[PDB]
C-alpha cells in the first residue's frame, strides 16, 4: 500500500463498475457510504471515480469521515464537508506488521495549518514550534515533522495496521462516464412480449427478419416514424417488431 502522509490517487475512468462485489464481500471491516447508500451504486452513473489508498492505525479509521479532527484528518488526509463517495477499510495485521517493528509506515504530526480537502503535502522541512528560527537543524522547538508507526504483530487491536480505500465519485459537467452493469435474459420470439434492446423500450411480437441493415445501424423505422425492426446486440441479427393483437 501507500503511506498515510503521501496517499495514492488512482483515477478510475470509463468502465463498468460493480460495487456489489465490493459491498457483499464481507471481508471489509468498515464500509460507510455518505453521499449515497451502498445498494444504489450499481444503478447510477458519474463522470469520474477517484480511489485513494493508504494505511493507518486501527482506531484512526474514525477520522476518515466528513467533519473530523485529529492528527490524521488535520494534516494527513482531509475529506470535504459534502463528501459523496464511500470509505472502505479492512484489517491487515499479517501483511504490514513484522516482528521487530515495521518502521516504513510514517505519518505527519506537525504542520502549520490544517489541510484543505483533498490536499497533499510531501515536504520534509524542519518544523519550527517556538519563535526561534531553526536553520535546518534539529533541537528544542525544531522538530522533524514525520513519525513512524512501529507496527508489531503482538499489538492489541486498535494498534494493528488497517488498510483504507476512499472512493470519491465526482460529477463535473461532461457528457457521461462509468456506470454500473445491466443484466439481461434470453430473447423469445412469436409471443407478445415486453422488450428492452439496450435502451429501446417496447412491446410486441418479435420475428426473424430478412432485411439487411448497414453494419452500423441499430433499429429501423417506418414512415410515420415508428420502430419496426431492431438488431440484437449479442448475436447481431435483425428482428421485426409487430404489435400484438387488438380489436
Amino acid at each position: 500500500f501507500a503511506s498515510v502522509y503521501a496517499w495514492n490517487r488512482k483515477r478510475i475512468s470509463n468502465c463498468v463498475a460493480d460495487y456489489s462485489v465490493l459491498y457483499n464481500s464481507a471481508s471489509f471491516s468498515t464500509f460507510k457510504c455518505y453521499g449515497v447508500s451502498p445498494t444504489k451504486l450499481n444503478d447510477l452513473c458519474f463522470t469520474n471515480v477517484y480511489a485513494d489508498s493508504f494505511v493507518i492505525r486501527g482506531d484512526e479509521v474514525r477520522q476518515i469521515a466528513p467533519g473530523q479532527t485529529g492528527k490524521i484528518a488535520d494534516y494527513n488526509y482531509k475529506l470535504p464537508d459534502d463528501f459523496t463517495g464511500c470509505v472502505i477499510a479492512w484489517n491487515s495485521n499479517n501483511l504490514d506488521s513484522k516482528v521487530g517493528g515495521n518502521y516504513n509506515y510514517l505519518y505527519r504530526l506537525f504542520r502549520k495549518s490544517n489541510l484543505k480537502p483533498f490536499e497533499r503535502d510531501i515536504s520534509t522541512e524542519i518544523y519550527q514550534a517556538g519563535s526561534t528560527p531553526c536553520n535546518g537543524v534539529e533541537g528544542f522547538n525544531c522538530y522533524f515533522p514525520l513519525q513512524s508507526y512501529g507496527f508489531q504483530p503482538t499489538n492489541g487491536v486498535g494498534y494493528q495496521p488497517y488498510r483504507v480505500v476512499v472512493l470519491s465519485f465526482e460529477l463535473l459537467h461532461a457528457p457521461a462516464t462509468v456506470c454500473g452493469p445491466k443484466k439481461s435474459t434470453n430473447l423469445v420470439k412469436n409471443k407478445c412480449v415486453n422488450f428492452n434492446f439496450n435502451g429501446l423500450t417496447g412491446t410486441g411480437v418479435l420475428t426473424e427478419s430478412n432485411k439487411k441493415f448497414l453494419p452500423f445501424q441499430q433499429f429501423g423505422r417506418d414512415i410515420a416514424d415508428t420502430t419496426d425492426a431492431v438488431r440484437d446486440p449479442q448475436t447481431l441479427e435483425i428482428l421485426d417488431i409487430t404489435p400484438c393483437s387488438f380489436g
Partner: antibody
Framework: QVQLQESGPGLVKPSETLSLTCTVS??????????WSWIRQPPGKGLEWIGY???????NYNPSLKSRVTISVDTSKNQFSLKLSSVTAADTAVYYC????????????????????WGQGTLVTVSS | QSALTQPASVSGSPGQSITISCTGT?????????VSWYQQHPGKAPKLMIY???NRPSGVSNRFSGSKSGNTASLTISGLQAEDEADYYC???????????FGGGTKLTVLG
C-alpha cells in the same frame, strides 16, 4: 515552564509490585514532541535508564529490566506511571521522572537524547 | 556497555580551567553526534547544560563547553567557582539495546 512531581511511595516489602506516578504541569502529555521516561539511581552509585512511553502507547524498556516493568499513560489527569513487579532488595533507589527529546529515526525506532526537566525524585526503599 | 567516565574523582583550583573527558566504546557512542552532560548537586535532581555534543540551553554560565574526539567526549570549564562542586555524568545514544547509556560519575572538588 514545566514541572514534574512523583507520588505513590511506601516502605514496600519484598516480592511486591510497587507503583510510582509522575504528574506533569505546564505541558500536555498527548502532544507529541516529547517522550516521558523514568530513571532510577541507587544511592552512592551512578544513574541507569528504565523506559519511556510516547503518547500513542509505544513503549521501550531496558533489556536488563525487561519482562518486569510496565509503564502507562493517563491523559485525563496528565500523568504517567510505572509498575515494577517482583521487587528484590536491589531496587532501593531514588526514582526520577523526566521527559526526553528523542530525535527522529529512519525506519528503525526513534533515537532520543539529552532529556529535559528531571522530576523531583522520591527515595523508595525496600526492606522488612 | 557503559561509557566509563574516564576518572572517578577530580581535583581543581579555583579560577583557571578543568577539562573532564568521557570515553566509551566505538562509533555507537563516540562516532555519533548525540552526547550530553549533567550536573547533580548532592541531594538534588541533575540538570543538563550541554547537549547534542556542544550546545548551551537557554541560560547557563559560559564557562561550560565541550567537544568530541574519536571515541572520547570532552567537557571543559574555563574558570572555577566555589559553587561548581557536584557530580558529572555523560549520556549517549547507542544502537545496541540499552538505547541510552549513562556515565559513572566524576567528583569535582574546589581545592583551596
Amino acid at each position: 515552564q514545566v514541572q514534574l512531581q512523583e507520588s505513590g511511595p511506601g516502605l514496600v516489602k519484598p516480592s511486591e509490585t510497587l507503583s510510582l506516578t509522575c504528574t506533569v504541569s505546564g505541558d500536555s502529555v498527548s502532544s507529541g514532541s516529547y517522550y516521558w521516561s523514568w530513571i532510577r539511581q541507587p544511592p552512592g552509585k551512578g544513574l541507569e535508564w528504565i523506559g519511556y512511553i510516547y503518547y500513542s502507547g509505544s513503549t521501550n524498556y531496558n533489556p536488563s529490566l525487561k519482562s518486569r516493568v510496565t509503564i502507562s499513560v493517563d491523559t485525563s489527569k496528565n500523568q504517567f506511571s510505572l509498575k515494577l513487579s517482583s521487587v528484590t532488595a536491589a531496587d532501593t533507589a531514588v526514582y526520577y521522572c523526566a521527559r526526553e527529546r528523542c530525535y527522529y529515526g529512519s525506519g528503525r525506532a526513534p533515537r532520543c537524547v539529552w532529556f529535559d526537566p528531571w522530576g523531583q525524585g522520591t527515595l523508595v526503599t525496600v526492606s522488612s | 556497555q557503559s561509557a566509563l567516565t574516564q576518572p572517578a574523582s577530580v581535583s581543581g583550583s579555583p579560577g583557571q580551567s578543568i577539562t573532564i573527558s568521557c570515553t566509551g566504546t566505538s562509533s555507537d557512542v563516540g562516532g555519533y553526534n548525540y552526547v550530553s552532560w549533567y550536573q547533580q548537586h548532592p541531594g538534588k535532581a541533575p540538570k543538563l547544560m550541554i547537549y547534542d555534543v556542544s550546545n548551551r540551553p537557554s541560560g547557563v554560565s559560559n564557562r561550560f563547553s565541550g567537544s568530541k574526539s574519536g571515541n572520547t567526549a570532552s567537557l571543559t570549564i574555563s574558570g572555577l567557582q566555589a559553587e561548581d562542586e557536584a557530580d558529572y555524568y555523560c549520556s549517549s545514544y547507542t544502537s545496541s539495546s540499552t538505547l541510552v547509556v549513562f556515565g559513572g560519575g566524576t567528583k569535582l572538588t574546589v581545592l583551596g
